[PDB]
Amino acid sequence: VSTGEFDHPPFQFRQRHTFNTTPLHDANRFGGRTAYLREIGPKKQGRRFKKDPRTVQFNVDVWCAQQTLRKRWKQRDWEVIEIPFRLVPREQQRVIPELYTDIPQMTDPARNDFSNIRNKVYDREELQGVLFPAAGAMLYPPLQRVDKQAMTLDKYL
């Protein structure tokens, strides 16, 4: 669910800066990207593409796809490294179908882990023996994991 604007406003008579009324090509709409298709004054191939409804809708569909791409790439705190089949963990020793090939696969339902394998992200400090066997100096420190059974401040002791 997203509350941003996706469609372009239609064509009518020339709007004015009023209450609940913005001009059709303004710097506020779509982050100022309408300056490519705006007219300041209140050459035939360079005038008619600004007034075609299918043409101005396709450009917003490109700009909204650019906004969809940059937020999907800013979510990536990981990267894809081709790891061979022998040094991979036990949940990746299975036959993994490609994207949109099968049902979205659970990781391992036998161990009560119902999650998609395609969104599984492994920490880099776990695979130091696989990714860096040539260094031999432990370039990344081990992850300090907190003791869940230790009496701490959250357990009133």
Partner: peptide, 23 residues
């Protein structure tokens, strides 16, 4: 404020007659 264009003024009775739309 990023609305820096020249504007058109409206009478206040036309604002309130919108009701639930904008006013």
């Amino acid at each position: 404020n990023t609305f820096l264009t020249s504007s058109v003024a409206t009478p206040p009775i036309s604002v309130i007659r919108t009701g639930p739309k904008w006013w």
